[PDB]
């Protein structure tokens, strides 16, 4: 029965039981957890328990601002740079899967509905030193699959209808709230299927669950010297509803595209040994020596 | 206008701050909330679900063999079968449990634990075990007459596939803390041991070795404080295809 | 009381009598899609007893070195009976499931079956960066076998899979598991040929063991779709 819980439950005092009838012995096979109370197992005292439960609220457990993107690029003249390089601008398809602390926390659930509070920290380093330029950056939110700019002075940066944020390095970090955007009532943290009508689509990736694109340029023309500009994107989920909890990820993540697994070479978190080994089942690992 | 002055902490980005921020999409109407089964509002709901202990965290126990304890017929009395270390903040048989993994996002914890053991021999397999919780202080008890002086349940698994050993919250402090020190008086919960109370006694056509699956959950007096990064996941590189998000 | 159980759906009936008190997933019973959650505006077909009935799959041989078995829903049923025909003739699908997993043996046999219904069991592959293909995931009525059931083939854990709707078949206690699944999707309905809402996983946590006469012990899966809706009628795909 659903109830409001702000503190952990009190313990009632209990006495000696010696009864022939009603049971510390439950039924595992029903899939139910043991409802055996400590009052029924040992002889207890009354404890008025004032321990709050608010820090394990799913809103508090997930509304931590976590690093989701970290991109360095050269801020310089890119007349003669490679066609792979971020030429004063990068684009980033927003995902929660590239950094494993946020990834494992969000993958504790099957479905998540949250607004995405996006914080953008920019740091700059000179590639001799003459000082750091207070550069203006543009972060433009582009939807999944939509047109992203192809150069720094692209006419896609005009943002007639795309939301752009302009921000300076000397400023506080740029901060935007992206709404809950999904075409569904929740994001699918795990998607058991293909999101395409042919059989060649990607498994596990529903583009409904992709927030969108951060297209981040430097608005400034290049300086006579080069700079390395590191953009860090932080996401805080908020107004979070979470559904269907899952086993946590035990093995190391291999990719962001899937739930592929290798494990570590030895215990802990190996394919065939998640917990580190002890010598025997009757060996106590941190036995007090007296 | 308004005379103001900036405080210390102006312009900082605390990752745990709690502020309204600018809507990137004005007048966006989010998709209507649909009822989805299994909503979690508080992580203590997950932590109260019993999940398999990896008591057989030994070498040669490979994969799924680690989630059961094989008990055999013995020819000496009062014999120790297995023991379980009890610090849920540490690595051990409790770590990859629902109570263990959520607790290791936290530092401080209070509250009783329940241990449920399911006997998985045959119907014809009979026997009695004693499951002892020893509050901390000294070494782990190795004989039965030493361990039954603590909290224990005696379990006939004749018709009864399961019992619960409540590990009651017996601590000096309101919380126990992780500090990477297993032997600390602020950390150590004590011990769970299992002994042959009688003997595993099977007939000739039952398998002579039987298995126990152990579970652990938290009770509803359980609490977790001081949220920290989990030591259970980590990276020293970028993952595969993470660069493809920039392309 | 908990052992005796009678399951009548349509023309199908199941009497299990060594059961262990059936699991309703997340305390939720299957319902039809209400009008305040509905999206597709055409009148759905609700075939009732033509689809809301037990579909027995092929039995699997519980053997000594078995790792586990999985079936994905609705994919295990998308080509069976009038459920499969309503799946093949409609774009949209919504139902719950009543899963009844059956495995008995003697009173001299030992063995525990974790029978667990996993929502959105996005399978990972082992020791590669390539995602699993269509043929690895969409097995249909035959189902698949767990590669590494200890991490549930997705890098997580068998040990914490009791967070999902599950029962056990401990051969001491019971011979049947019964899980009642509601609709479990972020969307109201779904295209049933490219998405699986539930994966029934059946895993040997304790292996089959005996010292009596060795018989083939099978695990039989009977799945009843519950409260079937089908929108977007067209030709058969």
């Amino acid at each position: 029965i659903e109830s409001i819980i702000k503190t952990a439950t009190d313990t009632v005092k209990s006495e000696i039981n010696a009864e022939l009838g009603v049971v510390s012995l439950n039924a595992v096979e029903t899939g139910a957890t043991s409802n055996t109370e400590p009052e029924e197992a040992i002889q207890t005292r009354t404890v008025i328990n004032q321990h709050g439960v608010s820090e394990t609220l799913v809103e508090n457990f997930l509304s931590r601002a976590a690093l989701v993107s970290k991109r360095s690029f050269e801020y310089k003249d890119h007349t003669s740079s490679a066609a792979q390089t971020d030429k004063n601008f990068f684009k980033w398809t927003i995902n929660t899967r590239s950094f494993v602390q946020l990834r494992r926390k969000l993958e504790l659930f099957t479905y998540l509905r949250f607004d995405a509070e996006i914080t953008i920290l920019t740091t700059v380093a000179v590639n001799t030193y003459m000082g750091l330029p207070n550069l203006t950056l543009q972060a433009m939110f582009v939807p999944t699959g939509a047109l992203t700019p192809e150069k720094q002075d692209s006419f896609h940066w005009q943002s007639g209808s795309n939301a752009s944020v302009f921000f300076k390095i000397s400023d506080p970090p740029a901060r935007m709230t992206i709404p809950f955007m999904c075409i569904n009532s929740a994001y699918s943290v795990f998607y058991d299927g293909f999101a395409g009508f042919e059989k060649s689509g990607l498994y596990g990736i529903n583009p409904a669950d992709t927030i969108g694109n951060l297209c981040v340029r430097i608005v400034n023309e290049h300086q006579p010297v080069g700079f390395t500009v590191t953009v860090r994107v932080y996401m805080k989920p908020k107004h979070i509803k979470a559904w269907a909890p899952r086993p946590p990820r035990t093995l190391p993540y291999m990719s962001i595209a899937n739930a592929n697994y290798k494990g570590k070479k030895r215990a802990p978190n190996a394919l065939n040994a998640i917990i580190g080994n002890r010598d025997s089942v009757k060996t106590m690992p941190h036995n007090i020596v007296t | 206008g308004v005379p103001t002055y900036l405080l210390p902490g102006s312009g900082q980005f605390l990752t745990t701050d709690d502020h309204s921020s600018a809507p990137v999409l004005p007048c966006f109407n989010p998709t209507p909330e649909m009822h989805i089964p299994g909503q979690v509002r508080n992580m203590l709901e997950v932590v109260q679900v019993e999940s398999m202990m990896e008591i057989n965290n030994t070498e040669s126990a490979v994969g799924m063999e680690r989630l059961k304890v094989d008990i055999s017929a013995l020819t000496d009395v009062d014999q120790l079968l297995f023991n379980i270390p009890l610090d849920i903040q540490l690595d051990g048989p409790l770590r990859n449990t629902l109570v263990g993994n959520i607790s290791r996002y936290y530092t401080h914890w209070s509250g009783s634990l329940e241990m449920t053991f399911m006997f998985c021999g045959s119907f014809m397999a009979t026997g009695k075990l004693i499951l002892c919780y020893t509050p901390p202080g000294g070494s782990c008890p190795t004989t039965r007459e030493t361990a039954m002086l603590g909290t224990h349940i005696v379990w006939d698994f004749g018709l009864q596939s399961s019992v619960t050993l409540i590990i009651p919250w017996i601590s000096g402090s309101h919380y126990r803390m992780f500090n990477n020190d297993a032997k600390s008086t602020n950390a150590n919960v004590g011990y769970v041991t299992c002994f042959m109370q009688t003997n595993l006694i099977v007939p000739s056509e039952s398998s002579d070795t039987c298995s126990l699956i152990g579970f652990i959950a938290a009770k509803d007096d359980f609490s977790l404080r001081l949220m920290r990064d989990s030591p259970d996941i980590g990276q020293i590189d970028h993952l595969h295809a993470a660069e493809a998000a920039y392309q | 009381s908990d052992r005796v159980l009678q399951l009548k759906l349509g023309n199908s009936a199941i009497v299990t009598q060594e059961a262990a008190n059936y699991c309703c997933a997340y305390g939720e019973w299957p319902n039809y899609l209400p009008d305040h959650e509905a999206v597709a505006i055409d009148k759905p077909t609700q075939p009732e007893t033509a689809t809301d009935r037990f579909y027995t799959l092929k039995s699997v041989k519980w053997e000594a070195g078995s790792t586990g078995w999985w079936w994905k829903l609705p994919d295990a049923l998308n080509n069976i009976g009038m459920f499969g025909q309503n799946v093949q003739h409609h774009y949209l699908y919504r139902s719950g499931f009543l899963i009844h997993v059956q495995c008995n043996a003697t009173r001299f046999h030992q063995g525990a079956l974790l029978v667990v219904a996993i929502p959105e069991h996005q399978r990972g592959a082992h020791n590669t960066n390539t995602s699993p293909g269509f043929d690895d995931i969409m097995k249909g009525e035959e189902g698949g076998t767990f590669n590494h059931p200890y991490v549930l083939d997705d890098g997580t854990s068998l040990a914490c899979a009791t967070i999902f709707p599950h029962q056990w078949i401990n051969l001491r206690t019971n011979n049947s598991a019964t899980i009642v699944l509601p609709w479990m999707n972020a969307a109201p309905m779904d295209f049933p040929l490219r998405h699986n809402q539930w994966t029934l996983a059946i895993i040997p946590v304790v292996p089959l063991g005996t010292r009596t006469m060795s018989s083939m012990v099978p695990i039989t899966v009977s799945i009843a779709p519950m409260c079937c809706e089908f929108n977007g009628l067209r030709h058969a795909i």
């Binding site: 702000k6 139910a32 | 809507p23 509002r41 709901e45 679900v49 | 997340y26 305390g27």
Partner: peptide, 30 residues
């Protein structure tokens, strides 16, 4: 405090103390 016109813009809602752990701990019918 929220001076934005969208309700999703607001700060986090750390006020929902409703629990129903029995949908995970007792998902049984009898």
């Amino acid at each position: 405090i929220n001076f934005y016109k969208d309700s999703y813009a607001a700060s986090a809602s750390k006020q929902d103390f409703s629990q129903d752990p029995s949908k995970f701990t007792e998902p049984v019918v009898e």
